[model samples]
Target chain A: QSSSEIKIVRDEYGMPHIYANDTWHLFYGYGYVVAQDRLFQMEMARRSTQGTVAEVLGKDFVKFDKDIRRNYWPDAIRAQIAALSPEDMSILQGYADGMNAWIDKVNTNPETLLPKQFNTFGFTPKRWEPFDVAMIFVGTMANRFSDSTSEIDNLALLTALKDKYGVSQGMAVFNQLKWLVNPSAPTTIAVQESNYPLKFNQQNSQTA
Target chain B: SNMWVIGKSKAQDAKAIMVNGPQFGWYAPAYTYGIGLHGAGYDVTGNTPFAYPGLVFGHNGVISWGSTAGFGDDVDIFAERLSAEKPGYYLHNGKWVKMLSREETITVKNGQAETFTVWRTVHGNILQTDQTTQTAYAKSRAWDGKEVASLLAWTHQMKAKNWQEWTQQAAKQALTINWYYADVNGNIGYVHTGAYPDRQSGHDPRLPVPGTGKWDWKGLLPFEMNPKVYNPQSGYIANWNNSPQKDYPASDLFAFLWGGADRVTEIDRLLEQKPRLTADQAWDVIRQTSRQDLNLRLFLPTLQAATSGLTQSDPRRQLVETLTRWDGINLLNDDGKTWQQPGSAILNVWLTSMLKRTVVAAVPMPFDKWYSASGYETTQDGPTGSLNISVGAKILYEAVQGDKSPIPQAVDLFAGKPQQEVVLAALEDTWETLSKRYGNNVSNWKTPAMALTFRANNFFGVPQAAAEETRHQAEYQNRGTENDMIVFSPTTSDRPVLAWDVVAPGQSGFIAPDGTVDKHYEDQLKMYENFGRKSLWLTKQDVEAHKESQEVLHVQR
Candidate 1:
């Protein structure tokens, strides 16, 4: 994990700036620091992803657990983990190891290392794995930008349109007035590719 | 979302400055994390998601930028006809096709595991099923699987130094966004960037279209073809989730629905009033909430005409007098108390109720049925703030101003009662309701104060730690959550001023777990109520100068 190669600097706003020799170490420091600052948040996020709140939170969290599990699968996250390149795999593993390092310390001295929330909840955090990180990322992305209300609203609007204007005429009116700001028909604009690279190549540590 | 860029030609200083405020839901552990990334190819300060390595909104010293949702129609629904003979199949191109299904089992916290089946078709994931109608619908969106690429493109955009470079980088974003840009070179511009789907010519993607392959999307439009304006002769550009352009093909490039147009119109008018603007003046214009009531202007004469027959001693006479004196300005008084005047509250409620009543009386079907069918209930509280209000205003405008009414179905309902009497009745109802709620003394009647409160959740596993609550009066109607104004001077480095109450001070445990006695908890709230702003330390020198505390972690080998 090359902990000695990294330095964490915190600004006045509590924003952390991780200085590292490479991408893997930078992420490792980020994971370690974030876990220290937001241990409860990290544990809750992992529990939500695995739908294991029942083990600690009891029956009250069952519905929420079901809802989260309905949309995501642990197997899918495992597949994503399997598909990562060796370099990317190292980055993910490094982050997991950093988190586990904190967990190990907390376990060694339960009285001093455990956060206040841990005592209040009467529960201990499980060890983090690379696949758990993937699962958490997937769970967050699934809920982030998607809106279920729009789907319901659109369905209601379609039903109304069909009932009011008969399918053929309704489709015509809907199509014509649907757009708020319409762009011009497609035309070509010569674009010059800049010297910038498309993806961040971590291997080139100094330049990336 | 709103952005303003004052060019050198229109600025008091021969330099450019930009102010941007993007409205979004406030969440815990905050959605945005302020960070400064320094590397060989990167040196930038901005806010992005906590785990995200890219910057969504920030500046690179040479250029500053921000964005708002483009309100594009990137999502579409397709209705599939379910086969009568087969239970789990849908009819496709002249044949019954088996629907793909998968079962998911969810473990409950202290309950049994529950399982459900999800179905999908070639169109997309099936969201709803109508058993009686034998139909199912699926949704297809632009970012369904294109999120990773979009995030990468945003990282590239952070490194852009000029307007041209920025737009080129932004063009690669899969999701729709209206980018507002201003560079140190006195250049200002706005670009609507995204990948918009190109569908068939005959049908509207707004409604659910048939699952027939004929309506399938051909491809996305070219990035350059997106709507954009660069250094327009209009002196400045303003957007409030309104139509970005005019008179283009009515394809499903953007959503037909939009927020109120009052803010943008007022901004444009305010800018035109002054050819040369200062940073303070720009901030004043941004915070202006004195929106003109176009509906009241058009209906005042009708209201007066209806009440003309009433005697001078009638109680309704006083209601009319109160409304006529209202200037439509929703501002706090010297004491910093909103709702001190009953005028705004009276007008808002009366106008909204009047519009709903008038529309309901005119439609042929029952009020509930027609209202729901027309989607009026979704925005009935504030019609002027939504598209339905404009539609209602047009219909009522025609009925009163023109010979033939467009909604003749409403004719019979209005036959027994005169239009003026209906309006009179609405005013009476408004007065009665207001008096009942806030006491009968008209002068004491005040508009309800608007506020935004931040509270911590108990999910942190601490039952004894009560959730901390912090609240401030966010008075203006179109108030910006994080208002900012940054002026780029050629000679010196000055910190940009910002009113960001959303970013409360204090770490998780620095204050009491309940946050009741935390000075940081109350600091921003007080500033926000006073319409105050703080200096944003973006530069290294500025940050260090104002640095309050620091923590250094030395990694161990």
Candidate 2:
């Protein structure tokens, strides 16, 4: 990469307007600007997403961070980056480059422009990967499923549907490519039956 | 200074052909896709902090339609138990398969590693593969088990070549998602897409299913099964997190996947009455404030009859009267503040008292559910100016005992008789806090008290309230809910009614000033107001001058 660059403008609302060449630069800038207006918030999100929240907030938050890492945070964003379309890849790269550039500039600045959380915990910005973007997408929707599952008892989501609508039919088939083409069709065609799949005792247990 | 990023001439050339009128437009530069045929190009105006280099808007000249999220059930968790012999994959068809496993390591405060492994089966993400009651969720729901996954995959199969393809793709969506479409024609369309899963037709998909064996999604709802409407004959179609069914007629339209729990009622009320509209009319409609009258379908016969008899005079009746007279416009020009100013707070107080009385009179219960003094007991509870227990007390006493509580000889005791007094006190409390923070001027209340300060990993917060009871303490702001409102605005600047909100501990999505998520992001609270109530306007000028966004892959000729 080359030397970092920074672009800043002002919107009518006095919100900071920023543009950078790469992901890290862009994120750092986003974080830096957000820190100026909302320092506490930036730190909380970073820690929460990274799963370090329990360290500061205690065990009450440990379960939350763990769930986040499992459901929302991906294993390797770089690996996921390889699968992105060219157009999407460029967008991701562009955002990443912008973020990297901001970090370089911040290091040389006179005063600490980044959030105090970074200093307090000795944290630095990480490179942006395509998976981060995917996680962002996943994060927005994850909460709904998560919340529903948590309150399944209260919502009576299952009982209400069964009582109001009906219960699910227990049918399994291999080569189950049927639902894709005809989403509305019933599970009538048993392509591969007579083979009892190893059933797991646990709700999410592995069967053979 | 607020300068148009691109000159008007350039901006006009960049607008979509479908979105007409000189007041509103959009453009997309991110990719070569323009908002519409006549789509123009310009820098976004106002205080938007982002450069938004690709997408821009104006009149029909330039605009680009874009969407951030495609509503669908993308992930599913499966509950599983593994056997010692076949440790990895579960058995199907009497064949043993290896489980797909991946290691996940998270960085802690001091660069330490917390490593864990996740296994995946053909069904998708395996949230749990071993039996453990200590699990966060007792059951699992999977989208990958049957054709439901493929259906969703097919639903996302389209890569639009033009506007037509884009709209078609939108029409075929299989999950809940909102759509924003702009065209060169100076026209814009926003549609909420989702397939109301027929869980009962075969099985209910709302709850987690047993992961062991013999469970499947019965079938999918056909594309036609979903609710939809084209460029509404009314000239515009919009939903700010409201019940989708009312946006169009159900007899001609399909039923909504969700309930009619938002302010879109106000929007329908505004748009249904208008025959044609203009550009300014569209602009004004976006900002209109008078349509939020009574809580939709809540009070029905009682509240409706109570205020219906009053003539055009009376403060209580005045607010409702003004609301009834509103043409469903939110303009703030030289005509002064619209009816929303006074009516907003008045309705809040009125609705609160109505609900309190309705509850207290029927139940005759204390604040604590367990407080049982029997004998239709009612007390003013101290010097009543602050809490105003009188009204609720009377209503409750009458509701349960068939008579109003005896009037206390002293002023303090009399305070316990009027429930409306208590509601008024709450209203005054809000008003005083607002004034103290923003000054005595009510105009400043327009901007929501809460805004997104930081959004990352879902940690959110808000400003704190003052310590004094007279002063509004820093309580989390709760403005949106699924069943709370119906809004109609000429523009798309109205607040989105959050579908799920609970008060007590706090609600979700409360981004803190310091960028932290409050644990109470999903709390259900009583005092929260729904801001989606708006007027629906369909101006002839708005529809005629409308254009399509160039960002779309397919364009219908």
Candidate 3:
């Protein structure tokens, strides 16, 4: 129950050589290190995952942010993290504190040294919330799939368009079938040069 | 006496330096997977805020596993037109429903609050929409167990006791990203999980789709359908972001849930060439230099056809012979030579020129395939040189062809002639053109051999040389394939050297002890010239780990 001791030894490549007395201390150092190296990414991830990006990026991102909130975030993560053990809860807080410390540093630093977006729009790093972490987990798993609303509307639109044209039912049926057919043989999926353009594939993909 | 440069050493490299400098140029060495250390017992320092409990953590004996970035398209944008009942709300079931709204306040440095209204859609949040344009879209997706099934696959892998559990875990994870998993067995696996979505079962949700009740997420496919691979015949498993397919023969593995690989594949090609891979050998493999895929097995005939005739002694013939004899390894373990630069550059330029010609001529098939069908392989005509000689003495000799200067720049005598062109104009003619392009000034054309590096970012030379340094810091862009480069050689030297430019940009998430970003935040210019391999932090023993820290709840149910 006592606070654990943590030590960070920096290597020549700037990798954090962390030595912690226990699990909590190790995470504390991990959180602090992540905050130091990826402050911008962490904040952006939190805001984006929680549907709060519009609050920082302006109305341009409002719709996307709101959708994130409704579909994921506070609701999803609150339930998940709540199920964790007490020890896990402490580790999460430790990470949050480390992130907050970085945020404090960024606030004190001059405008020139920070990212332009933060200064241009006046977006400061927010406190680390458990839900934000949950949101990140949620975002990673969020994939598109078929649902009732889309199926109904798509059928309706196709029918309306067909009716407007006075097309025969057979013709409409044929059109629908054509659309349903898989475009290419899955086995023959040839990778083009553009598919993995050397520069984009090798380097550009790694940047934040 | 040769001036020996002093370099600082980290604990990680204390065991790896026995092999001298790494021979490969593009492979990254081993390190603890960041996610694997998540729950592993370690101290949680509460000093910064980015990843609350840093992603990877552990002591000498304990470890944990975790991951980030939900690798799915859980958000959507829909287009809707407004109906008469209200200006903002759209029509539904013959009635106008008010659009969900919330006010977002942004604070400026001048102490002013700027407010923006965000609208909500049934699918998810309408982060932004323009009523003036009558175009509306929504971004939404379920982030719970719907996707948790995929993560469960990973969790199952952690809980797995034997090979069967490992197989089950691999079958579940289906996304393209890194996974750090460790156990008391001292057996660790870095998984590049891929979760390719069944987008066609419904609409393409990877991007913003039509939201007017016309687009919705369909159910995900079963976990069994996902692609996964375990520790193959190779003792180690690493993914440098390259094709997952090349890890095994086509007969052994099924389709990958993700697409082709990148630097990882390049690194693997070198590592797989060796049978007994030591820690030092693995480090050398991580430092491989060339980006040319070694699978030219299907393209040798076209090269032969293009370089046919023009006497048996043509330089073009020599170049072809050099490429043909390439083992796809960049290091020179035998003769202290490295051929990565000249070999890669020459092959790439030739392939590009040949492919361009093939494409323009409307070839019926891929250039590589076309050549394969034509029987690409040919005999190695002359000296089958090793990488050590190719990168060191060859490059140096080419650079100092006629210069006495210690830092002479090498003039590439074969900079721009295509194989077909050489055949058409004769070898001597191509050489004359190459020589004339630089006007006999070999000194001006010198290229430093030290530029070759195992760092993936260094594959294209320095960031400034590649046209991205002007935008982002070099270190940000200079990550290695995996943690490979970090374990081979420690980059602690203070004095500047040519080979120093060939190393990693430093370690991942590098920051000062005081929790500030390092001063060398972007000092990646000398990465390749300095032979800058980094260090690794693999577990040294077995222990139990935890994934918890301080607990707090704003509102408890």
Error of 2 at B534 (Å): 21
Q: Model 3, residue B364: displacement in angstroms?
A: 18
Docking class of 1: incorrect
Give lDDT for model 2: 0.31
Runs with alpha carbons beyond 4 Å of true place in candidate 3: A1-88, A98-208, B1-215, B231-268, B289-301, B309-557
Model 3 / residue B29 / CA error / Å: 20
Q: Encode model 2's per-residue lDDT on A1-208: one tens digit a residue.
A: 2215434332212223334444334333433333333333333444554455655544455456667666532443444556555644544444344444445544555154443344444444444443443343233333331123322331232233234323431111100100111111111111121111212121112211
Better of 1 and 2 by lDDT: 1
Clashes of 1: 5
- Identify the CAPRI category of the predicted complex in candidate 2: incorrect
DockQ of 2: 0.07
Per-residue lDDT of model 3, residues B194-243, tens digit only: 44333333343322345444344444544443333332233344433222
Q: Whole-model Cα lDDT per candidate? A: 0.54, 0.31, 0.36
lDDT of 1 by residue, B1-557 (tens): 56667776777654776766555433233334455554425556655443444555667777777776665556667778886689888787878888877776665545677677767777767877888988888766655554444544666687788877888878876666677777776777877666666766654444456776656666776776677777666556676555565423222322233322223555566677877787777767655532343345445666677677888666566667776777545566655445445655555565656656764444323322333122122221222111223434433443454334322232333446667776787778877888788786677666554334332332222121224332324443344445556676533334332212224322232222232232332344445444565554455565667565554445542
For model 1, how does the per-residue alpha-carbon lDDT over A1-208 read when each residue is reduced to its tens digit?
Answer: 4445655555555655555655456556656655655566567667766666665667776666655554443554566567766655655675677677778777787666666666666777667777776555445433433322253454354445556657655433333223222222111110121111112111111111
Better of 1 and 3 by TM-score: 1
Better of 2 and 3 by TM-score: 3
